[PDB]
Amino acid sequence: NIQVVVRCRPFNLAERKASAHSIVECDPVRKEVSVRTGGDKSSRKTYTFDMVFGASTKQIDVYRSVVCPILDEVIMGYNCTIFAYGQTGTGKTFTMEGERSPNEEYTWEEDPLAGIIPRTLHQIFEKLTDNGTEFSVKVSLLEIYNEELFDLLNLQMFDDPRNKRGVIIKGLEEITVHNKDEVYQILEKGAAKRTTAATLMNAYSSRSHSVFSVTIHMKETTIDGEELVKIGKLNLVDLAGSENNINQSLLTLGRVITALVERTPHVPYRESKLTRILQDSLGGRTRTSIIATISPASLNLEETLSTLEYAHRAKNILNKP
Numbered sequence: 001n002i003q004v005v006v007r008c009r010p011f012n013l014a015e016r017k018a019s020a021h022s023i024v025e026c027d028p029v030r031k032e033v034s035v036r037t038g039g040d041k042s043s044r045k046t047y048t049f050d051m052v053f054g055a056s057t058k059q060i061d062v063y064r065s066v067v068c069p070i071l072d073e074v075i076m077g078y079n080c081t082i083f084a085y086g087q088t089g090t091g092k093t094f095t096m097e098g099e100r101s102p103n104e105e106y107t108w109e110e111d112p113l114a115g116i117i118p119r120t121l122h123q124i125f126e127k128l129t130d131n132g133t134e135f136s137v138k139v140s141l142l143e144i145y146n147e148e149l150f151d152l153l154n155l156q157m158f159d160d161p162r163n164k165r166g167v168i169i170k171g172l173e174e175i176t177v178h179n180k181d182e183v184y185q186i187l188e189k190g191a192a193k194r195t196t197a198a199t200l201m202n203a204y205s206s207r208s209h210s211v212f213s214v215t216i217h218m219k220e221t222t223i224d225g226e227e228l229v230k231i232g233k234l235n236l237v238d239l240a241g242s243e244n245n246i247n248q249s250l251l252t253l254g255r256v257i258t259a260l261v262e263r264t265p266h267v268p269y270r271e272s273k274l275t276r277i278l279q280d281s282l283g284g285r286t287r288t289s290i291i292a293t294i295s296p297a298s299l300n301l302e303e304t305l306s307t308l309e310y311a312h313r314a315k316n317i318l319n320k321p
């Protein structure tokens with residue numbers, strides 16, 4: 001139930017300035033990433049994943065391929081989580097949040113540069129208004145920095161007495177999003193925050209986990225007129241940069257993912273703030289996906305191999321001859 005995909009972004013100008021060369025070749029059809037490792041010429045390691053998106057990949061492609069099937073499961077009343085993992089500067093935030101094309105050329109709903117979070121919020125309204133039923137949508141956004149919780153929309157964690165796998169975050173702002181106009185407003189506010197953030201703030205962010213949670217309450221009425229409510233939650237997690245001190249939440253999440261994939265009887269959720277928060281959306285019926293982001297440039301060989309080695313172990317798929 002854990003999908004692992006790789007997304008490689010295009011070369012950037014910093015990498016061209018450094019005179020780096022391309023060491024990554026992506027093959028979306030074979031689902032492979034091959035990396036030149038010798039600096040050598042023939043030295044090469046190949047990894048196989050569930051999906052591989054190369055540099056030309058559009059935001060809408062990632063959304064349709066990765067998120068849509070997961071959203072469908074959330075709408076059935078399950079809790080699911082999608083992660084972006086990788087070195088700082090490789091595309092975690094672009095993938096999760098994306099951005100607005102310059103000059104207001106598009107609405108957020110239609111913008112080709114919008115990422116997973118804005119697309120998910122728009123699709124929830126689409127999918128459920130055309131479904132015909134009554135529903136509400138709430139969002140929260142929290143940051144985990146140095147094993148402490150911060151509310152990005154405005155904290156203390158306690159186990160939830162009415163949910164053996166869940167926690168209650170005291171004081172966390174959960175805002176109702178009533179329509180698509182309110183979606184636009186939250187996105188405009190977030191972009192303003194990103195755009196005007198000082199350098200120290202961006203830096204903090206590169207070392208922090210961001211957890212955007214959308215909770216959907218869906219009402220049905222049995223034939224005789226009884227009201228029933230089901231709840232689905234989708235956590236969209238932009239992880240701290242993976243480059244090498246040790247991030248306790250990231251190491252703990254890795255261990256949790258390993259325990260889940262290997263069917264280790266003890267899954268160490270309690271060992272970190274992040275994994276306690278995500279416990280109720282990990283390990284169960286639920287679809288989980290990890291999007292591992294990488295750079296194609298030679299400058300980043302060590303960090304790219306680190307990411308690929310981890311992601312490969314998390315899925316372990318044998319290369320097809």
Ligand SMILES: COc1ccc(/N=c2\[nH]c3cc(C(=O)O)ccc3n2Cc2ccccc2C(F)(F)F)cc1F
Nearest residue numbers: 097117118152186187189190191193194197201202205
């Ligand atoms: C560098 O420090 C930052 C860390 C997280 C950030 N992410 C945020 N902050 C947000 C604030 C508000 C608000 O005030 O209502 C709303 C959304 C925020 N986001 C997330 C965000 C930011 C830009 C674009 C899209 C998104 C979103 F909502 F995740 F899709 C922004 C930063 F500037």
Ligand SMILES: COc1ccc(/N=c2\[nH]c3cc(C(=O)O)ccc3n2Cc2ccccc2C(F)(F)F)cc1F
Nearest residue numbers: 085242245246247250251253254255258290310311314
């Ligand atoms: C800067 O500090 C860190 C950098 C990378 C990290 N990445 C890790 N550490 C992992 C440990 C284990 C284990 O011992 O079982 C397994 C995976 C680990 N990863 C990779 C990781 C971690 C969290 C979420 C996804 C992933 C993965 F596999 F890369 F997709 C963890 C850090 F704490």
Ligand SMILES: Nc1ncnc2c1ncn2[C@@H]1O[C@H](COP(=O)(O)OP(=O)(O)O)[C@@H](O)[C@H]1O
Nearest residue numbers: 008009010086087088089090091092093094095
């Ligand atoms: N696939 C991509 N195509 C074009 N630009 C990208 C892509 N991925 C990331 N970028 C850009 O590269 C820069 C760093 O990406 P960002 O998502 O902030 O990385 P991270 O969160 O991993 O540090 C940003 O300006 C972002 O828009």
Ligand SMILES: [Mg+2]
Nearest residue numbers: 092093094206
């Ligand atoms: Mg980022």
